Amino acid sequence: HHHHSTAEAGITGTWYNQLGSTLIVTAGADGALTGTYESAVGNAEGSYVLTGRYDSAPATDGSGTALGWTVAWKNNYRNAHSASTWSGQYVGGAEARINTQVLTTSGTTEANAWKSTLVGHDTFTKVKP
Numbered sequence: 001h002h003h004h005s006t007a008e009a010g011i012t013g014t015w016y017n018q019l020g021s022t023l024i025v026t027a028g029a030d031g032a033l034t035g036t037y038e039s040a041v042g043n044a045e046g047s048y049v050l051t052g053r054y055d056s057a058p059a060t061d062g063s064g065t066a067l068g069w070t071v072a073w074k075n076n077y078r079n080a081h082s083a084s085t086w087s088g089q090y091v092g093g094a095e096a097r098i099n100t101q102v103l104t105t106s107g108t109t110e111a112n113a114w115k116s117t118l119v120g121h122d123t124f125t126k127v128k129p
């Protein structure tokens with residue numbers, strides 16, 4: 001099913017997901033995403049560093065803008081020994097969204113690697129749900 005036939009201004013700022021988490025991101029001119037993430041759930045307290053990338057020249061045919069970012073869940077307060085990656089697309093307009101699927105991998109022994117990774121889906125909006 002996979003194949004092949006500003007974003008910057010739209011992405012930069014604060015976003016909120018359906019769990020009550022807060023994303024604070026700056027999109028750089030050459031594809032960088034940098035900022036912080038605060039999770040409303042899980043083994044998390046305060047803000048965590050986030051870094052990622054986005055397509056800085058997306059298609060102009062009504063398609064979304066591909067992007068992704070990572071948070072390692074270690075900061076000055078807690079270390080969950082886990083990291084999450086969100087993969088998705090930014091959809092602009094009056095009801096802008098970042099629609100993502102997210103993998104959360106915990107450090108495990110080899111015996112437990114089969115249960116290392118969660119998959120979920122987060123939808124981000126510019127106003128709090």
Ligand SMILES: O=C(O)CCCC[C@@H]1SC[C@@H]2NC(=O)N[C@@H]21
Binds near residue numbers: 038041042104
């Ligand atoms: O408990 C952990 O291992 C660290 C916190 C994980 C929180 C996850 S990341 C995917 C989902 N979306 C969120 O905003 N919070 C949870």
Ligand code: NI
Binds near residue numbers: 042043080
């Ligand atoms: Ni956890």
